[PDB]
Each structure stands twice: as structure tokens, then as C-alpha cells.
């Protein structure tokens, strides 16, 4: 039934050492992630350092990546913004350029600006009225906004284009179960995230998609395939094999994991983050590569 399933890794934003956008590295990283087996791509998400770029750069990347994907895989464009009209504009802007789906945090700002449920509902309702592609609601700690399972289900049933969900708050597996139980057939895509650290538990709960990091979709995807085909022991086997790398990305190297792997493999030219995000500790990067070389991922043997 669902339009979109599988692994949809987050595309990192590639900068040159000057801090400017490095679009040549950007298309190569997309090509690798496509060649790695991704069922799709999510762009301008938090692992893309979206908070560190400008509206103009955000426009450049939505055209650059979408035109370079050329229809190979579906693309999820992250369009989060406090203003409803801005988010609807970006979302409509994304669909015209060929986006298959838009993802949006609830409206929020910083540590103190929160939006009541009634206006959060209006926010997603009006973005849904503006576009013809489905909306993925992001339930992540960065928003500091509580989206209960009953409220999430209510939006999927009462708002047409609300159909997908990225549950990455603590206890996502239990929340995924309740989201599916309460939303019924309006929950088209209950997905998890957080670099697939709880993927095994979430697949038990009914997750049909995973928004992972971009470093090694090839290493994670067979877990979902083995889960869909009922090969649960193969699922635990691959999960246990790649869990130390997943755990290192989730806890140590963080956002810069994919870029540090893509740079060591010659996929992109510079793994630098945009200042002032701290760069990777040399030992943290050393341990990341040590773990990654026990698993032989495509990123280190692609260029």
C-alpha cells in the first residue's frame, strides 16, 4: 500500500574548506548514497546542518540535488520553519522541483518559543492544503515540542497530506506501536530515525522505514529487507554486526559521521562542518574508521 518504504538516509551538506557550498562534492555524495542502495534521500535535515545554511543556499541545494537525482530515487525535502506560510512556500517550492515528499518539524524556535497543539494542527493543515505531495511529521528532541501519539494520529486522519512520521524521541518503538494503533489506515509511513540505533526494536514495533545517516546505507538496508521477508534471525545478525558503528555515529562522531566516512573514501573533498560547530576529535574519528574498517562499507571503496 504505502507509496514509500525502505531506508531513506540523510544527505550531508558538503562545504569546501572556505565554508562555501561544494556542489561537486554534493552530487558525488548523492551518487554514492544512491549507489549504496538507498530507497530514497532526505535533504536539508539536521544531519545536513540545515540550521547553519541560508535561504539562498537552501534554494540552491533543492534544485542541485533534485536535478542531479534526475528521478533515480524519491527525495524528501525538509522544509521546517516557524512560519506556516514560509513552510508551505518551501514545500510547494520543493514539489515543483520534483520532490516526492516534504518533512517538517513542528513550528518552534530555540529553547523557549513553542506553539500550542491547536496552532500546530493549523500549521500542518495549511501546508497540506498548499501541496499535492505527502507530509512527513518529524517527532525529534530538537524541537522541544511534545507531539503525543494521539495528536500525531489525529493529524494523519484529519489532515490529508499528513501520512508519514519520523519518530526519534525516547521510546520510539512503544510510540510507533501506539501511533499505528490509533491512526489506522491514515498512517501511511511510520518510520524511525536516530541513525538506526533502535532499528531492531522499532521494526518489531511496525516501522516500515528508516531515516539513517548517509555514511553506510548499504550496511543497514539488509536489516530492513530481512525483516520484511520474515528472516528475523538474519535481521538480528546484521544489526549486531553494524551496531557498534551505528552506536559510534549516534554517540561519538554524530552529525559529522557521514562526512568523515565520505572524505576518507574520497567521495567528498572536505568533511569540515560550518563554524562554529566543533570539528571531530582526532581520536573520535580514529575510532570511527577503526570500527568502519571491520565492516568494509561501500563508502570506503567507492572512489
Amino acid at each position: 500500500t504505502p507509496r514509500h518504504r525502505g531506508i531513506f538516509p540523510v544527505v550531508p551538506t558538503t562545504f569546501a574548506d572556505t565554508g562555501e557550498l561544494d556542489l561537486a562534492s554534493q552530487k558525488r555524495a548523492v551518487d554514492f548514497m544512491i549507489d549504496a542502495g538507498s530507497d530514497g534521500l532526505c535533504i536539508l535535515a539536521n544531519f545536513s546542518e540545515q540550521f547553519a545554511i541560508t535561504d539562498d543556499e537552501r534554494d540552491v541545494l533543492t534544485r542541485t540535488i533534485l536535478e542531479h537525482v534526475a528521478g533515480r530515487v524519491p527525495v524528501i525535502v525538509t522544509t521546517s520553519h516557524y512560519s506556516t506560510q514560509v513552510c508551505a512556500a518551501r514545500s510547494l517550492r520543493a514539489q515543483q522541483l520534483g520532490a516526492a515528499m516534504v518533512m517538517a518539524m513542528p513550528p518552534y524556535h530555540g529553547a523557549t518559543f513553542r506553539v500550542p497543539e491547536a496552532q500546530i494542527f493549523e500549521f500542518y493543515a495549511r501546508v497540506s492544503d498548499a501541496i499535492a505531495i505527502p507530509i512527513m511529521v518529524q517527532d525529534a528532541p530538537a524541537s522541544g515540542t511534545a507531539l503525543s501519539a494521539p495528536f500525531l494520529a489525529r493529524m494523519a486522519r484529519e489532515i490529508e497530506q499528513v501520512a508519514y512520521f519520523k519518530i526519534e524521541t525516547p521510546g520510539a518503538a512503544n510510540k510507533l506501536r501506539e501511533l499505528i494503533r490509533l491512526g489506522g489506515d491514515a498512517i501511511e509511513g511510520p518510520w524511525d530515525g536516530e541513525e538506526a540505533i533502535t532499528l531492531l526494536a522499532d521494526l518489531h514495533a511496525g516501522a516500515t522505514g528508516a531515516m539513517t545517516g548517509g555514511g553506510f546505507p548499504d550496511g543497514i538496508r539488509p536489516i530492513l529487507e530481512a525483516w520484511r521477508e520474515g528472516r528475523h534471525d538474519d535481521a538480528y545478525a546484521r544489526y549486531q554486526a553494524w551496531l557498534p558503528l551505528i552506536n559510534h555515529e549516534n554517540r561519538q562522531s554524530g552529525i559529522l559521521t557521514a562526512k568523515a566516512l565520505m572524505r576518507e573514501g574520497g567521495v567528498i573533498a572536505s568533511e569540515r562542518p560550518r563554524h562554529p560547530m566543533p570539528e571531530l576529535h582526532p581520536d573520535t574519528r580514529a575510532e570511527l574508521l577503526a570500527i568502519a574498517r571491520r565492516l568494509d562499507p561501500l563508502v570506503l571503496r567507492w572512489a
Copy 2:
């Protein structure tokens, strides 16, 4: 000795009922606030709904307001952004269009993306390198970032343009006390904020400027002048008279307090916030105007 002191109210951003920028009303709001006796103005701050406007709208508002002010009063342009290079470029642009000062939060995003002290310092150090006008460090809850007084004085002594501070975390008076003690004459501008709810205590602590709401700066300003010339009983008198209005702004009508008074006074065409910020409860608005009509502020008798 210092370049700036007094009352520097926040200019709200005036939208049309459709949500687009209402530049005609935006110019009227500036002229009223200048006519209310404001020593200066600060634009694109939290009470300007800056988190709900686009980058293009920032540049539109920065030029349009800095052109309409025509050097009458100095203007602080808020340029906060996570990226160091983006904030520095906005800060240089503000300087080129005639800003007397720039205000920037520490780099942050949402509830979870924080920056360590070392990189925060580098952030302000690099923005100071790019400009020749003073920088106002903002110490506010919205950033979720701890900026200790030893670290704040650290920056004022060892970063060239860092000389002004807006203190509005809880216990701001006692923080203003410790900041002035550790920093001395390097603390050129120890200012307070939060709509001047704690102004009297902050004046005791040694505050020389106040960034307040934009609705009634004529009501608050005599307390700074009365304190400037040692009339602390006159200062208390005007503080007690206007504190119920200030308390209603801080606790009830919030960001929209200024636009509600201007719209009632015919100063602007629309007091609507940009959705999804909740609109004022009708009782909250009536109670706001009931207290305002008791004190005869210029905004209700200007058009």
C-alpha cells in the same frame, strides 16, 4: 563616556492581514517610536517575530527601516545566526547600511544544538573581525545557552567589538552586578531587557540601557532619566505607575503587546502575528487596553 545609553525599544514587524510585510505600517511604527522619545531602536529581535521571517525579508526590513530612520536615532540590528560566517556577513551588511550596533545571540538551534564556550568565543571573535561597529551580546533564555559573567567579561576585554550586553536571563540584576564588577570599563553597555519588568532592580545593579517593548517607551523612559539624575523616588513613582502595564506585556499580551496598542491607535494597519503564533485572547487584549487607557501612552494619541 559610552556611545549609547537610555531606552532602545524593539520595533515590531508589521504584517498585513495576509501575512506579507506591511512596509507602509512598518514606517509608521518607526516614526511613532522615534516620536515617543526613544534614544534608539533595535530591529529584528524576538519581539520583532524574527524567527518567522525569511532572509530576504530581513534584508528588506534592514534597508527599509535604516533608510526611513535617516540617522535620526541610532539603530541596533539583530543579526543572530548559527553560522559564524552568516552572522558576520549580516553584521557587515547592517554596518554598511548605517547600523550603530549589532546584537547577536550565541550560536544555537532549537532545544538540542549547543555550542561550547571555545567556539562561542571564536564566533564573536570572528564577527568582531568583520565589522567596525559595537557588538551587543544577548544573554537570553531563548538560546538555551549558559553565558557566565566571567566568560562575558572575558569577551569584552579580549574581543575588540564586544562591548554591549543585553541581560535578560533570570536574576539579571545580580548578573549585571557581577558582569560590571569583573569587566569594569570594558563593559561599555550593561543593559537589561525583558520589557523592563525588572528595570528598577537592574538600575540598582548599574544598568545603563534598556531594550523594552515598542508600545510605550515614553512611559518607561523617565525612570532611566530619573535614575540618571539621582531621583530614585521619582524613579520608583513612574516605575510603580507603569509596572501593571509592563507586567501585562511580560505575562499576558507578550510579543503582540506593541502591535495591539499601535493597531488600536491607528499607527499600523494590522496587529496580527504571523501564523502559527497564537493571536491575542480577546480578554487579554481588552485588559491590555484597559490598563493602557489608564496611563495615556503616546501610541493611543498619535494618529
Copy 3:
């Protein structure tokens, strides 16, 4: 209509200089606060430094303060605890010593340990099933726990003893409006707190009670008097006169406001908090007494 209304200020916990309980100063403040015109008292709340005392001191203070009150005014005993059975046992114990009402935060601990709505409901339902006195649900920032107006109203409808509420979260006035509309007759006591900083807005919203600081109940009570008597303009004027002192308590002197006023007024022997809560800044203490001496509060003219 309701069992209780009016001002219900929080009784501070009086320590000696070295930090042990000063029950002698503890009883004098109780007498003073009743002299100042309190419709009732709340003990062991946040302004009582309840987080800094032991379980044995909690029972000592509950037994001592309730016996010294002698039924003069109703007493709300704060019984908050993470554990359902501990809070329920505390609330039954308080009821047995003469407590008129119990106040309980939702179950929580620290910055990270929270409780789902379904178990918060079960928490209060079991605390209600254990006692025969009203329960006041505390909606305050300290718990870091979201309690919506529909959830609070549902608890008031479906859980017998849940009938009072202390709304202290931001936007308390409009939340009181939504609570009363959704809860109806189940809302016996929609009250506010936060030292009466938002009282005038809250009285507009329908607030029938206030849990304030204990330093100057005589200063705040006339606002609610004039409000229940329809003298709206006199309520504003009284609110405006005492607002710089309320504001100084809310923003500057904080918890220690009541103790600094009671110490200076000779009501208690020591104002000091229990370490490591910082002591009052000298300037902050001086500005507190300066503002108070403009208002002639009983705490600075109590001869007992």
C-alpha cells in the same frame, strides 16, 4: 460554592543559623501569617524549601504546624512524591493530623524522569482513593511536566478528590479560563500562585484563590476582597501599589523574601536558607526592605 477560597500563603521553613529546624521561629511565623489575615496556609511547598528537608522533618513540621494552628484556619499540606503509595500514605497521614487539603505535584524527578499521562491519572486516582479531603493539583514549572487543561479538567471530573488546582505555568490566566470552561462544576478551586505576580489578570480569568508568599499576606488580600466585592478599580489600585514588592519577591529575593521580612520584623530568629541555596545578596535584601517600608506591612510592625 467552594470549600475554600481567598489567600493561602506558603509557610516558610525556619532554620537556625546552623541549619537545624527552628520550631520556635516556625510557630511564630504561623501565628504572624494568621494575624496578617490568611484565609489559610500551605506548608511544605517550594517556598518552604521542602526539597532541602528530610522525611522525618516533614512529619515533625506537619505535626507541629497543624497542632499550633489548632483549627484556626485550614491548612494545605504539600505531599508531593514520585511514588504513588508514598504520596498517598503522606496524604492520609496529613488528613489524620487535621489537614484540610493536600497539594501534590505530578510525579517527577530531576530533569529527566517523567510519567505518562495515563500513569499520572492513575497516580492521582490512587491518592484520591486513599483520603477523604480535597486534592490540589499543582501545575508548576518545577515538575517539567505538561498537564493540559483538558487533562486537568478530566481528572477533576473523573477523580473524586481532585477538585483544586494551582496554575503557575506561563499564561496561567488563559489556562484558568480553559480549565473552568472545560471542567465546570468539577473545578472547585481554580487558584494561582507565583507570589501573586499575575493575580489581577488571574482574577479576571476566574481565579477564586491565591497561594502567595508568606511575607505580606495583609498586602495582597485586599485585592481579592475588592474583586469579590466588585470594586474593580480599587482592586487595580491596591494591585498597583503592592506590585513592586510582589515583583521584587518574584524576580529578586525569591524564596527568601518571606524569611528576610520575618527576620527583620523580629518574627523569626534566622532568615538563612539551608545550604547550598545561595543567601540573599545584600543589595537585593536592602531593596526588598526599602520597597516594603513604602507599604507599611504588618511583618515590620508585629508585636508578639
Copy 4:
């Protein structure tokens, strides 16, 4: 050269189904965890549901557990409390009953009551003046209190009994690197926690001790043994084998992991938490046992 190192798992608090203390199961739990190779034990911590018990239960549990240990292993008693004198008196009482060490969060309450750095320093300095056993500073998210690495290093270099640390804030490994460098010889034990989820990275950073869950210390301890012996590939191997179980405890079953495993293995009579802590979802419990039964833990053959 440090007094204490190795694995010091948290002893959960065993309740009855009714909610009362189940002391009979409590002693069995302690005996199993000692049987599982624990270098020491930590009691009344967060995985013990310390926030759900009263002071009297706190005292009764400290007496019962210490007496049942009889000095077989060193015991760390968690004595956290906002009040300095209350924490000092708890730490002294723990000492007189034979505790080798005390662990204390910085003073805090709920989501809004924080203590400035200077008063935190006085808090630990005063608890140190009152006792003659080492102090473990707990740097954990539950306190909502930021403790920088220079500050933690300063407390140990300048406060006598402050000598151990449990680093559970995010990015613990990189904070442990800085704390170890800054603290110098003054840090007797830089330890990690969080059920050993970051154990490998924290061993790289120089952690010499781990405060884990109580369900399978036999499964985690060989990781520390191999690392101290310099067998880093073996340390990774045992870490990978047990990481699915560690991950499930950290993210899915949580505090109830140890008790659920012990109840299944017959160690304890009831795995329930104290209400209103939610009970384990049955699917979460079934996934936990499925993973544990792939590893032959002592808890399922005790």
C-alpha cells in the same frame, strides 16, 4: 594504584507486586551480582529507583545490603540530596556502616532549582569535611546541572575526598579525556555509566571503571579486563556480542531490565517497578529475553 576500579553495577531495589520492599529478593540480587564477578556494587542510584523510596527505606536498604555483603566487595552508597548537611549526614552514616565510597549528584531539585558553581563547590567540600571515604561526583542528565571538566578537575585537586567521577552526560568520552588531563593524579577513578552503552569509546578515553546495570555484569566485565590487558580487538569483540543487550537496556527496557532478567531467572520474586513508573511493555520484555538468551548470561542459570 587507585583504591577502586573495574565494574560496579547498580543494585536495583526489589519491590513486591504490592510495592513494599522485598528484602528477601534484595539479598538474592546482591548475592547474584557478587557471584557474577562484580568488583563492587553501587546502591540507591537511579537504576535502583532511588526517587521512588523514602528515607526510612533508604536507611533500611543501606543496612540490609551492607550487612549482607559482609565486606565481600566494596559498596558505593549513593547519598544525593539538595541539602548539604543531609547529604553529609547520609554519607557519614554510610561510612559508619562500612561503605567504601559515596556517590552524590550535585544539589538540584526538579526542572527549575539549580545551584551556582560556587555553592556546588561548598556542597562537596562540606561533605568531604564530614567523612573519611572517597566521594564520587555524578555528572548525569537527571540533575540538569552543568559541571565543566575544569570545574570537576578543580573540585578533585582542591577537595580531599573528591576523587572519583561518573561521567554520563552526552559526549562522555571526550569529556573524560579533558577531565583526566586537567585533573592529573588527583582523579583516582574516572568512570562512566549509562549501562555501558558508550563503554568502548570511554575505555579509549581512559575510563578505569564502569557503573553498569545489574542484570549482566558477568557479560560486560571481560570487556574491561581485556582492555586493561591491552587486548583491544578482544575488547571490541565482547563489546559487539553484548551491545544489542546493552542497547536494549539503555533504550527499551531501561531501569526494569535487571529486574526483568532476575525475575525470569528466579533470582527475585517480582520485577515490577513502583507505580507510577510504567511497567514493561510485553513486547519489550519478550525482545529483551530473546536477546539475552543468545548470550547465556549467569542471570538465567543462577
